[PDB]
Design a protein around this ligand. Structure first.
Ligand SMILES: Cc1cc2nc3c(=O)[nH]c(=O)nc-3n(C[C@H](O)[C@H](O)[C@H](O)COP(=O)(O)OP(=O)(O)OC[C@H]3O[C@@H](n4cnc5c(N)ncnc54)[C@H](O)[C@@H]3O)c2cc1C
Ligand SMILES: Cc1cc2nc3c(=O)[nH]c(=O)nc-3n(C[C@H](O)[C@H](O)[C@H](O)COP(=O)(O)OP(=O)(O)OC[C@H]3O[C@@H](n4cnc5c(N)ncnc54)[C@H](O)[C@@H]3O)c2cc1C
Lengths: 93, 279, 280, 82
């Protein structure tokens, strides 16, 4: 947890994937997020948060859904395909 | 086992797409009702379908049914809950089973509108089962369009401090005692920063979260990431949506609602979908 | 303002027919130009399995179904070929050799046209009847695809210093002695500032201007000012051309050549055409 | 004389297209007054030959448009040239 907070302060946008084992969409995003991290190695860095394991992290940022992608700059709720996420990063940087 | 093409809907567009995809030796699956389309069967007389002057809807429906049966095309009698565009393929989600296919074609016809949902979607829900733990000890309201929604409402009662269930259908409700039934017409969702209250015609409910569990999902929700403008799926000349390898045809695209456009739109989608498999 | 139809449909193929029946559905006066046989391709095709509702049906049999439909709706095909269509603004003037017609809206339904090699680069430097006086006492070459060209060549020969006729058809040619017959296939036209020579497979001809007389005109020539890209008419979702009141449907727009696309396109064009008439 | 000082639609009575163009030209002048002249090729061949008119229905500005053109295209071209 501490390591994540240190990374949040550093940088190079940082993307948080909020997911739960039970939620089907969240499972879909992790493979998409893994593919995004492999594709992007410089523009941004990705971290995965299990909402089940880190309830404190979730409440603090006001996560509204089990599968949510967060980068303060912008917040995407619900499953999204790679192309949409990538484009949102591109402009937002 | 992944099919080459998956067709969402068994209406004129879906069938028109199906026969063209099957013609070119590509594996095809069609999701829909055993009856092709309620509109086809219901139509009294059709004069604007070229070649079938004065044919009854049910009579035209028969001609279409013969076409696919004679071609060995079977309708998968299931409803598609969700379709997740993975990048190279599409995962199709259904309560009874899960399928994946390399290309998708949408033939959903028309769906019910949403009241002021999209204003604070982040602080609103659609999955319910996904978001229940977040609302532990909080007020939850459910707008139910089917029995599955009732069951989700019973589930929420276990976690939430208060659960409201608003039925849009008239039926006996199988609900636990904790759930409160609210028989009124939803109007608007309002909140300052996040959802705070749901306004009905003759009642107001203060609630932290609102869940709208729908029987006929909109295209945007059914396919996460699909670009929809003016209530109809966006398509270019080839019937391509914003998602690569995802096509749409028929009433869903948004042009005049007619059989001959629907079949044409379906054909163009299928032929182009086949083209993309190669090259 | 005489006999102005609400909608004029150019071509009697599936797209043209699909548009016609829809325009007739909404009580709008319609005229359809085309062949009595509607479409050669329909009659010629062996079987259709991808037209929904007809399985393994021979082309000629499907053509019969189309004849019954229009016949039942009181739609008659005017068996003439459309030479030109001039967009005047509020209406369209439709020229044929036999008569002249005017319509508020137009729908184009012609599947294919003759290709041109090196024509469009020097078109400006080289409508023979309209521009013949300019070439008095100069060399002019004619490429003829129909009998009208022979008559035009004889006319041109009287005014020009020299007339060449390149026939693309094999038939007896009724031509004056002054006109010279050249039995070869054109290859390329060449010129720096103005047209200078027309190159054939085994021959080269020195000429000031070249006139190309075709039996099946391309859409660009048929409708002056029409925007065409990639050999097909450009159309938006509603089947609208660059011309404010001109639609197009079927093989002419482009894409896959198929019956169901053609009829769908024809329907959308017609319905849109009716809608614009309704607003007024 | 006035036209030469200021320095055009070339039309002929036998050409149908040139006929259509005339009335179209007339509408354009009425429609846009602020931002046209008709040349009869039959009566002024010298004027036509001097400018190199090679097709009877030709519109001359800087820019020359040969063959019939609809109101929208001609107007757009004129606006672009300005
Ligand atoms: C009474 C009536 C008369 C009509 N008459 C005419 C006429 O005379 N001429 C004319 O041109 N047009 C007519 N129409 C309209 C025309 O029929 C429709 O536009 C056309 O039928 C639409 O076909 P479609 O498949 O695009 O939509 P539909 O035909 O409605 O296709 C919908 C199909 O998709 C299935 N489906 C939908 N959602 C899902 C999902 N989420 N998952 C799985 N499956 C799904 C549905 O169950 C259904 O099978 C008429 C309509 C009506 C109601
Ligand atoms: C043997 C053969 C088999 C085929 N089989 C199939 C099949 O099984 N399934 C399928 O989907 N497609 C098939 N096609 C292709 C399909 O027929 C075409 O895409 C379709 O015919 C296009 O219809 P259309 O109305 O747009 O144009 P067309 O059918 O080509 O229109 C021709 C008509 O337009 C008239 N016309 C053209 N220009 C003018 C003009 N300037 N002025 C006046 N009239 C004009 C002509 O008189 C003619 O009657 C086949 C084609 C052939 C040759």
């Amino acid at each position: 947890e501490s390591i994540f907070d240190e990374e949040i302060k550093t940088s190079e946008p940082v993307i948080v994937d909020f997911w739960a084992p039970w939620c089907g969409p969240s499972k879909m995003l992790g493979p998409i997020i893994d593919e995004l991290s492999e594709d992007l190695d410089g523009k941004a860095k990705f971290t995965k948060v299990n909402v089940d394991e880190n309830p404190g992290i979730a409440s603090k940022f006001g996560i509204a859904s089990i599968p949510t992608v967060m980068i303060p700059v912008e917040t995407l709720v619900g499953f999204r395909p790679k192309q949409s996420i990538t484009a949102s990063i591109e402009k937002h940087m | 086992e992944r099919y080459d093409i998956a067709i969402i809907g068994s209406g004129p567009a879906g069938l028109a797409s199906a026969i063209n995809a099957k013609t070119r030796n590509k594996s095809v699956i069609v999701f829909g009702s055993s009856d092709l389309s309620k509109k086809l069967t219901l139509a009294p007389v059709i004069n604007n379908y070229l070649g079938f002057y004065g044919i009854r809807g049910a009579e035209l429906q028969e001609k279409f049914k013969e076409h696919i049966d004679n071609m060995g095309i079977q309708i998968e009698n299931v409803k598609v809950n969700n379709i997740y565009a993975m990048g190279e393929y599409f995962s199709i989600m259904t309560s009874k089973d899960t399928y994946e296919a390399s290309k998708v074609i949408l033939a959903m016809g028309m769906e019910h509108t949403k009241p002021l949902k999209g204003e604070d979607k982040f602080l609103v829900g659609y999955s319910a089962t996904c978001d229940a733990p977040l609302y532990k000890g909080k007020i939850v309201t459910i707008v139910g369009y089917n029995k599955e929604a009732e069951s989700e409402a019973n589930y929420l009662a276990e976690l939430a401090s208060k659960v409201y269930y608003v039925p849009r259908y008239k039926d006996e409700y199988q609900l636990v005692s904790a759930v409160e039934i609210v028989k009124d017409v939803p109007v608007e969702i309002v909140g300052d920063k996040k959802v705070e209250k749901l306004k009905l015609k003759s009642r107001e409910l203060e609630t932290d979260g609102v869940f709208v569990l729908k029987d006929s999902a909109p295209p945007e929700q059914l396919v996460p990431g699909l670009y929809v403008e003016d209530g109809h799926i966006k398509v270019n000349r080839k019937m391509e949506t914003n998602i690569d390898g995802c096509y749409a045809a028929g009433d869903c695209t948004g042009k005049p609602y007619q059989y001959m456009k629907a079949v044409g739109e379906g054909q163009v989608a299928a032929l182009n979908a086949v083209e993309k498999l190669y090259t």
